[PDB]
Amino acid sequence: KWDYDLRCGEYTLNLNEKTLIMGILNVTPDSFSDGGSYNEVDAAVRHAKEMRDEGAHIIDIGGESFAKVSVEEEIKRVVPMIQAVSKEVKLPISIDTYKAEVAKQAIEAGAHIINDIWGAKAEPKIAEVAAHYDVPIILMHNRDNMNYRNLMADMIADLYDSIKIAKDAGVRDENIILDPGIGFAKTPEQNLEAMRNLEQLNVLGYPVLLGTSRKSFIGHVLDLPVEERLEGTGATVCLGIEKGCEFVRVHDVKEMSRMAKMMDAMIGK
Amino acid sequence: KWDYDLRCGEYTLNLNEKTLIMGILNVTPDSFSDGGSYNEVDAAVRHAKEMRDEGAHIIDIGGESFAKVSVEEEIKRVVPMIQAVSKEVKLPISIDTYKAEVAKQAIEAGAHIINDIWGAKAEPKIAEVAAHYDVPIILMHNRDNMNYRNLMADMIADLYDSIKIAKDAGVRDENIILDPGIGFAKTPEQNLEAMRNLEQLNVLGYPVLLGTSRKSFIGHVLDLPVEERLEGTGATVCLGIEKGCEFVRVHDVKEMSRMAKMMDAMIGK
Ligand SMILES: CNc1nc(N)[nH]c(=O)c1[N+](=O)[O-]
Ligand SMILES: CNc1nc(N)[nH]c(=O)c1[N+](=O)[O-]
Structure with a gap:
């Protein structure tokens, strides 16, 4: 399916061999620090190690989500963790991050991929940062409103607008990944419709990352709180893989890695 | 999709509303009994109650699987449990059961559906029993050999042979359910191919039940023992539902009911 691998500097990710698991780092800050304090960084490193041991392929690290923080404060949190x-x-x-300066300092600190929840629309200079360091960037679907004329057609148009911002800044095709933004600017009903129709995104010709883990729409369907959403997350991961996604972004790496390995074997990936 | 409900005597199962969960009753016999002894029956009743409370729609009860047993001995085990x-x-x-006499006595004891792992081929009179009591019968794909010319084409031919045996005995179309027999007369590789192609079975025009729970092919893929196959079972249940199956036969009812409810919401069932 893919005639290139994702080049991540010292690492290379093959897009054809298996579904790639992105583990979500828990990044809880210490209350009396703005810092790379031992407790907060040590906890993050332990968590990264555990996700690696349970089958993660990428570790996703952020600096907001928790005391309120300016850009300078966000960098001071995330850089020590990345290091x-x-x-x-x-x-x-x-x-x-959706902020160009955070992206830049994070890459300087050692980050390999930019994961942008605003798809280069909040701060278009982030695509300039991406193009310069020659790193992959994930362009997620997101909007400041839910006024769809037609959900899937509109998601694809919106994502194409993100692709144009990136390509116009010099981002190479091989460095673009898309994501439907499940749980962003969508009703619960719209998140289900997007899941049901996820294979449409494949027409744009880029790899797709799916983020559904523990999200409210699963709670809407099952009437279960956040800590009881493993089975529902699982269903979303399996459907996403059947519909052709190359990556999943998940909290529960052990369980979802197993589900994904089984799905891969069945579909012939 | 279905213009009829499954009529199960005092119960009715709708085939359009949700994926139906068949819970596998654990049926462990007491060693010094041939009987409906208290320990063995009480344990079965408790297990049936738990599966009901966790979302099961049907309870599957058998008499072999454990001391060796003749037909008379199998009936003496299963009847008290059904009662x-x-x-x-x-x-x-x-x-x-694949045995006509067991089926007959089980229905007399209160059973509503015949679940036959030999698809009326081991004892064709079982279809006569089915037709007479006007109960649904599940015809599973099975063979005494793995010599396929072409796995899916051969499974469909084999299943059609089962359908012909049932219809010739007077079984009505509305009382036929099919099952691909995952883990029967198939290599691990063939069980994966069958999963990947399960939607072909839908051409025969009958509802489909999928049984994958905790099976060896999942162990083959994940290199995990029987008690560590929940996530793999889950993947198989999700793929089966996406490929249009109406029932799943499972050990872990809580977890699989949740997965199935989420899948149903996504696919629009
Ligand atoms: C950084 N956060 C995310 N990033 C991507 N790419 N997709 C998500 O669904 C989410 N998410 O749900 O939070
Ligand atoms: C009674 N046992 C079964 N019955 C059906 N219908 N399908 C199965 O996969 C199995 N199974 O795997 O054991």
């Missing part, structure tokens, strides 16, 4: 994880855990790191 | 479950748990019961 320590990048030294201690041999996996590529994605930086979860 | 007690049928009195205490308000769900339809399927009798897991």
